[PDB]
Amino acid sequence: YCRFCAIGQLRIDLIDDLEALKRFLSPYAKINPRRITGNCQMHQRHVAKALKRARYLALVPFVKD
Amino acid sequence: EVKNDDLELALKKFKRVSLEIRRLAQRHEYHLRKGMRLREKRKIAQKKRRKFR
Amino acid sequence: RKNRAPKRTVLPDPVFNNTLVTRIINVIMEDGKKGLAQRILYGAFDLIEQRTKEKPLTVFERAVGNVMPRLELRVRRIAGSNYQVPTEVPQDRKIALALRWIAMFARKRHEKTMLEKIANEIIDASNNTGAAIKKKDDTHKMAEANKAFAHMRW
Amino acid sequence: NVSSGIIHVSCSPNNTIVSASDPGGNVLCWASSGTMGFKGSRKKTPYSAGIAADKVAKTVKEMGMATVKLFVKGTGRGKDTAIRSFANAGLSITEINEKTPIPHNGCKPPKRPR
RNA sequence: GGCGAAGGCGAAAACUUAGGCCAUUACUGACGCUUAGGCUUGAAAGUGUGGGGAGCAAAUAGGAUUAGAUACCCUAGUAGUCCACACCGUAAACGAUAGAUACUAGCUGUCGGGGCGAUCCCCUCGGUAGUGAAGUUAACACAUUAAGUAUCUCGCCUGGGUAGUACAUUCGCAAGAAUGAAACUCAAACGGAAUUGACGGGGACCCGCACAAGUGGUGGAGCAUGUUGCUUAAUUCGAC
Structure with missing residues (x-):
């Protein structure tokens, strides 16, 4: 279903919410596409940008499992 | 990359991953044109999702 | 596309009462005609028991069983040459090839009487020394070389 | 002696190089197809x-x-078949480790077989 | 899926700014399209450039089959493999369908905005594809994101091989880019659509000693017979 802009109050950040973004990412530390996440393209790109920011923040490994 | 959920059967789950690695690693064994790279990647993705549904 | 066919062989020869000696009649056969070949086969039995006493039934069955080849080679080419991949065979091919080897090496030796050389071929095929057991050793030692490409799918 | 270490299997495009190595740096054995x-x-x-693989195992x-920890490439x-022969020969495995060479448009290998 | 003129743009973050759209019940009040002028951009690629330059490679050296392999298998190899700076400027730069607009079957849509509303769904404004009515074309299809109907403005084509060829002249150190023939020659274009069987060292396909597992084997040998080569006056003729 819809995975972003519904699990939050429309105020977007990266603190204490990656645990809610984890299940939108396969255990492969890979960003699940809109095909897998199923959210809207706005929310899919929300998830993608947040997860890639977390990767650059060492919150989630890039290609490491 | 690292796929393992069992003590011994992890290779059963890894067979499909190995086929996927074959089809995503035949691109790293030789260089080919970028336009054709994107074309083949997107075409194969659309073909696979077409057969899934 | 041809499918599996029956493996027919003429019924047992009443002198020894098994289809095995009849298949030997049929495969050691030259221009098949059972007018004279049966008397010569009776003599062959005689020379078998006279030389190094061995009941033909038991020695022949032991030789056939031990010589039994197991491996066959299928073909897959690369348009430049051909290679082989090993597969398994049933007991019918095993016994057919064993009888074939015994019969073919029975007719081809060098001593006075042809009866003597067929008897000697039986004797030397008795103890599973190489007259036809070499084929069983060779197939096992060469199909293992064709296992080289066994784990490859193409 | 050793009961848990590191083995690096390199499935070459036309070979497979298997060498058991210790985390401290030393190695145990190396056998190539040649x-x-x-x-x-x-x-x-x-x-x-x-x-x-049977020989090294x-x-x-x-x-x-x-x-053994196994870093398999190729x-x-x-x-x-390498891990199959490892398991058959008593050399069990814990999991497959993949730090595989997936470059992000990196170096250039020799041209494609055409 | 979207952004931007097509070209291009995807690890994250910050810097300056973007066009455009929804509701504008708001406002100047046709200010709307327009090219020859005048430009820049433009994948690549080549040149210089200051360094960088992992990696491999245009030519090349070799090793192999080969009819030979300057192709294809394999490794080295030069420029090049990036930004900052200039020339360069073509492309399957194509929706092979110019910019903008007036609407016009239908269905599902896909996203962004707005409305609604736990989410969600639905509708609507735009981008946004397939399906398919009618019309049209040679058909593909276009098919409401037209190729239906047209509108303002621009650029292009007037049987062909010739030939984007020489030249005037423009840009560029150059290569080339821009523009651009003529002469000779033919009666059509390797002219597009579509039919027919066929072809395939394209695809599945079914059986047939066709293959395979065989039996015996032939051409090997002695002897026959046909034919071929000669040669005769002819070894009648032919078949092939």
């Missing part, structure tokens, strides 16, 4: 890789190695 006398056109055959099991049934 070290057994099957070098030049038979190394590419997966059974040569399986036999090399049996010598390191004589060294006592039950399980794709195909060679990387599968």
